[PDB]
Amino acid sequence: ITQKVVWVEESDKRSFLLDLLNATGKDSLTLVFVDPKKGADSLEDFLYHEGYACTSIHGDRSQRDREEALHQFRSGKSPILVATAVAARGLDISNVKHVINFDLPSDIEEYVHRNLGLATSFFNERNINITKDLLDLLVEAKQEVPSWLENMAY
Amino acid sequence: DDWSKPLPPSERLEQELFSGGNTGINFEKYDDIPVEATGNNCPPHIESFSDVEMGEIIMGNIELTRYTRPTPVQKHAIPIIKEKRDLMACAQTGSGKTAAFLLPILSQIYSDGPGEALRAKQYPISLVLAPTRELAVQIYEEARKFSYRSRVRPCVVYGGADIGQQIRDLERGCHLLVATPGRLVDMMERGKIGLDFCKYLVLDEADRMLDMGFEPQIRRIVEQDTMPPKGVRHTMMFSATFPKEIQMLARDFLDEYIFLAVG
């Protein structure tokens, strides 16, 4: 499954995500993982403001709210779902064409945890501790390895 | 590394650089042709280079170049670029485009530095595409004058000259690349140039680039590789004519852009 790691400074992640979404076909189903330090609301509400049909899950909300969001997503009415890792525990993501790691996690095991056609991950200096582990994995999947990612693992 | 702080001077370089160059401008014709800008929140035009703060390195290089009053294109384009607003400029070669984009781009590279990725095969911070060796070299020489005493090392590559030595010159370091489009695609296919950190993109004489058949190469470099998308990179497109194909390239490549017309 195509894994693309792109260098994206923090202040550029929102504009980079907009372009990744503007290229989505009919907006196939896209799952966007965000760090809880930012929260899924910040990204969902920015997407809404920007005119996108999207929705979010959180781990502290009612099952009624979760299931309404998940149905909007699954049925393609809100084909973008924002989630933290905790919130997406147990999530059946077998119908998701595109996973976007807006924030990468601390450890490569969580990354491994997250019909999947593409995983795009945003990377910058805050993610240095996972460079070699992410490197090793991309080699295993016979995946494109950016030159700069090896020179940073060094 | 402070990128805003001039490196020590070299007499030989000043002699090579600041004697015997030309601006590529026709001041007689173009000082007296008005420029108009249109778009949302268009920054106001300047009257002097001093009206924006381009920093120590550019102001000294401006003095060594003996540049004085900006042309009208420069008066309108420099604040636009300095605000990081995308630009579509219907403006002729000879109206003052080159400095209009090089001064604020270089200025911004100096006050921002290379970025965290570079601070850690060649990954230019700025790319300028040109239709011909002659314009590419014109632009490269202007870049050399305004990167004097800076960490920015400009390079130029073009077709009809030998890829081997261009490669060997790139390997010596490249922060701003001027290129003709087919030669850059060769360099990309050979793994010599990466576009992951290209934050300033200029297409000069875009109408001629299209007319000479470079639109496939341009879409590959800009849309189908690792160049940051619009809204992330800052993009400037210059063209003396504004046919449908340039309007399409403008709509595809530029984000929320100011339109500038000479005349």
Side-chain angles (χ1 to χ4, degrees):
Chain A
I1 286 173
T2 307
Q3 306 173 53
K4 291 180 176 282
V5 182
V6 298
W7 180 278
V8 194
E9 297 193 342
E10 287 297 303
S11 57
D12 290 318
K13 286 181 169 176
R14 275 181 194 199
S15 293
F16 209 127
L17 177 69
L18 290 184
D19 180 82
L20 278 191
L21 303 172
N22 280 328
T24 312
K26 64 179 180 180
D27 215 312
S28 64
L29 301 195
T30 311
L31 172 56
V32 185
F33 284 93
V34 302
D35 192 277
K37 165 145 197 205
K38 297 186 176 69
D41 288 323
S42 61
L43 213 47
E44 185 207 349
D45 296 338
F46 168 75
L47 289 182
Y48 177 100
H49 180 61
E50 287 292 328
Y52 287 86
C54 58
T55 188
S56 56
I57 56 177
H58 305 253
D60 52 345
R61 297 294 181 192
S62 78
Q63 191 69 18
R64 288 171 158 270
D65 291 332
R66 183 171 186 93
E67 282 182 13
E68 176 54 30
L70 289 185
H71 177 84
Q72 296 305 41
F73 183 62
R74 287 193 337 254
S75 65
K77 313 163 176 261
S78 302
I80 307 158
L81 180 61
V82 191
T84 60
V86 286
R89 189 126 190 288
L91 188 49
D92 169 36
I93 294 169
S94 55
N95 51 338
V96 71
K97 183 178 179 180
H98 194 184
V99 166
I100 300 170
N101 290 304
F102 189 92
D103 298 306
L104 275 157
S106 282
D107 74 9
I108 188 59
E109 297 97 322
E110 204 201 302
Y111 175 106
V112 173
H113 259 302
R114 352 163 162 166
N115 174 241
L116 186 43
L118 176 59
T120 311
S121 298
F122 293 173
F123 183 102
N124 63 48
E125 68 272 12
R126 298 183 172 211
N127 301 124
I128 206 45
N129 297 331
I130 55 94
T131 324
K132 178 50 149 102
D133 287 331
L134 178 43
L135 170 54
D136 299 341
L137 175 133
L138 280 171
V139 175
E140 174 77 59
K142 293 179 179 179
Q143 289 298 310
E144 58 254 61
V145 186
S147 173
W148 56 258
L149 193 65
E150 342 190 28
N151 192 197
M152 266 176 220
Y154 208 95
Chain B
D1 288 306
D2 196 341
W3 278 58
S4 83
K5 186 179 178 181
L7 290 166
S10 178
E11 196 99 349
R12 223 183 298 100
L13 242 192
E14 275 181 53
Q15 311 311 290
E16 183 35 50
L17 284 189
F18 304 111
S19 73
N22 78 77
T23 63
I25 295 162
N26 179 346
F27 300 104
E28 174 170 31
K29 181 173 172 162
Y30 282 110
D31 281 335
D32 296 339
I33 298 180
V35 172
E36 185 188 6
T38 62
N40 311 302
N41 292 318
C42 177
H45 84 269
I46 54 168
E47 282 291 341
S48 159
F49 295 120
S50 294
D51 281 0
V52 291
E53 296 190 359
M54 269 171 310
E56 181 174 39
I57 298 191
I58 301 287
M59 290 307 94
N61 287 341
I62 281 193
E63 276 318 300
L64 289 172
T65 56
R66 285 104 69 217
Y67 288 9
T68 56
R69 293 178 179 83
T71 67
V73 170
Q74 292 163 3
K75 285 175 179 189
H76 286 71
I78 291 177
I80 293 170
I81 294 164
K82 202 54 170 49
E83 292 294 284
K84 288 166 200 273
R85 292 295 306 281
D86 287 5
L87 174 70
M88 171 69 231
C90 193
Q92 310 90 324
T93 298
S95 72
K97 296 178 275 157
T98 308
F101 60 84
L102 280 186
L103 272 60
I105 290 173
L106 283 165
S107 174
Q108 275 161 337
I109 296 171
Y110 303 152
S111 57
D112 290 351
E116 294 293 315
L118 296 166
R119 285 193 239 236
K121 184 75 184 300
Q122 296 301 308
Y123 287 98
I125 309 166
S126 172
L127 169 72
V128 186
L129 300 166
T132 67
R133 180 209 156 261
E134 290 84 359
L135 183 61
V137 160
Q138 184 82 50
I139 293 165
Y140 164 71
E141 307 274 35
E142 200 79 353
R144 281 180 78 215
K145 303 174 212 168
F146 286 99
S147 60
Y148 174 60
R149 303 188 68 182
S150 87
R151 291 164 197 285
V152 166
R153 174 157 196 274
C155 300
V156 56
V157 301
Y158 42 80
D162 184 71
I163 205 155
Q165 181 47 249
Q166 284 166 1
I167 292 165
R168 284 189 291 286
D169 168 54
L170 290 173
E171 282 169 3
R172 308 182 57 205
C174 185
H175 311 83
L176 183 150
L177 181 69
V178 187
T180 66
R183 177 52 50 101
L184 170 58
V185 166
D186 289 345
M187 292 300 199
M188 293 177 316
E189 289 174 345
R190 294 157 182 261
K192 305 304 191 211
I193 287 299
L195 296 182
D196 306 36
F197 312 120
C198 175
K199 302 300 292 296
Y200 301 93
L201 169 63
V202 183
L203 298 85
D204 203 0
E205 290 195 350
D207 53 343
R208 297 184 76 215
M209 283 199 293
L210 260 55
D211 188 36
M212 296 170 63
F214 284 126
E215 175 169 22
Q217 289 71 39
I218 288 154
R219 282 183 182 279
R220 181 177 181 170
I221 292 148
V222 170
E223 293 183 317
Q224 327 163 11
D225 214 286
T226 60
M227 182 155 302
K230 61 190 187 168
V232 172
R233 70 172 190 252
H234 311 294
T235 313
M236 296 133 273
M237 184 179 308
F238 296 89
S239 190
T241 57
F242 190 63
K244 224 49 162 181
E245 311 84 17
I246 294 296
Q247 299 159 325
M248 283 316 114
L249 207 66
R251 305 312 199 161
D252 294 347
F253 282 6
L254 309 172
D255 177 56
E256 183 62 33
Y257 69 74
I258 304 300
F259 178 87
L260 186 158
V262 175

